[PDB]
Amino acid sequence: FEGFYKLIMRRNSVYVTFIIAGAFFGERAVDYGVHKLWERNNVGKRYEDISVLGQRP
């Protein structure tokens, strides 16, 4: 808590590391959330939802 907190606002190297970590996780969290809502809005329309998938003849 206080240890990381105090380091972030007192050393710019820790703050830059904090920015990189927040960019990395915040980007993945949004990409995960966007894709979950894309899946909920497109039920039945995915390539893996084709009934005849695998029997061409």
Binding site: R11, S13, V14, V16, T17, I20, A21, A23, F24
Partner: peptide, 28 residues
């Protein structure tokens, strides 16, 4: 202030390398 700052930026650079290049699977 000279070694602490050097380790701090070395950590920032290493995290940035892991962030730009994301070799999640090269940990072998």
């Amino acid at each position: 202030i000279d070694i602490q700052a050097a380790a701090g930026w070395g950590i920032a650079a290493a995290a940035g390398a892991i962030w730009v290049v994301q070799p999640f699977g090269w940990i072998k």
